[PDB]
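Model the whole thing, not chain by chain.
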Amino acid sequence: DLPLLCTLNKSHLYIKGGNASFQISFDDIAVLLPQYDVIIQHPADMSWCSKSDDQIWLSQWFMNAVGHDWHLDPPFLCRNRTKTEGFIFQVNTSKTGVNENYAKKFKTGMHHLYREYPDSCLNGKLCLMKAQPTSWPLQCPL
Amino acid sequence: QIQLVQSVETGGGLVRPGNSLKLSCVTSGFTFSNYQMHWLRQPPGKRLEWIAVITVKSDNYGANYVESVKGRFAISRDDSKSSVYLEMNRLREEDTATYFCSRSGIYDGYYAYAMDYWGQGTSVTVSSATTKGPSVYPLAPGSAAQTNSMVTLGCLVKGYFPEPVTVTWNSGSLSSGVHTFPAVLQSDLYTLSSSVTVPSSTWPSQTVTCNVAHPASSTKVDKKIVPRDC
Amino acid sequence: GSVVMTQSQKFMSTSVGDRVSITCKASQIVGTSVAWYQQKAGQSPKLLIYWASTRHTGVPDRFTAGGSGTDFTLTITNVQSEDLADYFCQQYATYPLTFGSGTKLELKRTDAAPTVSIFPPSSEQLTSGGASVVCFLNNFYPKDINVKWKIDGSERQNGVLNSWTDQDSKDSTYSMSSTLTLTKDEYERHNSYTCEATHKTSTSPIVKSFNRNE
Ligand SMILES: *[C@@H]1O[C@H](CO)[C@@H](O[C@@H]2O[C@H](CO)[C@@H](O)[C@H](O)[C@H]2NC(C)=O)[C@H](O)[C@H]1NC(C)=O
Ligand SMILES: *[C@@H]1O[C@H](CO)[C@@H](O)[C@H](O)[C@H]1NC(C)=O
């Protein structure tokens, strides 16, 4: 089984693996904050992100796909599964400061993952990627 | 029209310490199952404090509570009835507040706990005091002071419990220049006063009556204000 | 361990058409996870903005918010009479969700002297064995005021209970009632009862009196 990804309207990216489906969005809103949220410095720490193994596996699959190095790259955040706001994880994709090299490798990884990828992140501005559960669209490949 | 109505299933808002009270909040005008529900209580003269939250059916109806409330309250919901409930056990006097139910949706595409819509709120008081009806006392000048263009009359209700009472003048027809002051609690008893200012030509020429209603004690009293004599 | 939201100004006086900013201070960094609400007369709150600066759909154009980190401000431009209410912030970045102390928005007006009225105990209450003297201070501005009770010229500060109203929506003034409760025996012992009201409007306090013999 291989996760399949479909893009609709060239602005939103949807990935479905198994029974788990996510929607990837880019904006400057910092939904997750490092002070109060789980830090993913090791792939085994993602068990705190969800109660469903499908969401954990699909999350781990995506970071492996974009070339995320769990021990060299900046750690990303995810919401503690004990909270009720819902599943989400957030990667800093801002092309600025010391995060420049990682942000540039993330753009390369997305461009190889999705054939049509609109890079919303602009140089010098904060850009935060967030993947949250969503109902799988019936208007995109199955 | 996204209307949230709060009611009490058993009795009234007043409850004794250590007893159990269940709050029910019924929603309408939107799909209840789609959004999460919160319970919020506001103590008198204090900041609003969050109590509990319950999530949608997609998640396994998970819930979160605050530390002070853990092990005493239980939040629940019924999608068919489209209503959210709050069951409160072992109530302490600290729990006296006005309780609110609120809805939280999706903001800029992400789940956040900002409160979209709210219920009207139910006043919950927990104390060892018992229900007592008020005493209505007229307040007249007595012609011991100079009369000006306007004359101020008054009404005093004393020794009632619990809140609230309804104070009107001439069955509500006289609403101009009326002040009903907030009640004061001393020795487990509430006492408030209400003033009314009318033209000096209108009184004692015309009748001025003070109407007090205290539903908890089934008390409806009308007291006519007459000038004092000796 | 819980983030607290403190508002430096508990009360703010403004005029119609003026600009007003309400500042919210967080004990810890909450980033952008901040909302603002509006509440009138203890009724149900109404959401104004979310994510620090995103105005709610129902909210009018006058309200604008902003901020990041621990400092968040809410500004109102061309303030209307309907904008006079309570405003408080909230953070949803961490459990538990915590709200601000609150700021009350009040309308300025010219100074008004308090109308003072004194009332003797009623006949109905006297038969019950209690005697309560009530003093009304109505329609005064500014908010600051203070009262004294004198029994035969001597100050009394025992069984006195006070109550203050909020700013009246019609004439923007304030009011206050003071009640001195005593037993029938101690009330009949004395003859003169006065309440003195002190206000900014006068250098000398207002005095009203009634004598039991007269
Ligand atoms: C995402 O990364 C960017 C860049 O590394 C962060 O922005 C900088 O954060 C440092 C923190 O010390 C500040 O000194 C800089 O001024 C920030 N730059 C800009 C342009 O604002 C950003 O904070 C990170 N976001 C998260 C959520 O971690
Ligand atoms: C998630 O929450 C639980 C209980 O609130 C806590 O024990 C746990 O440490 C949290 N996870 C992390 C990674 O801190």
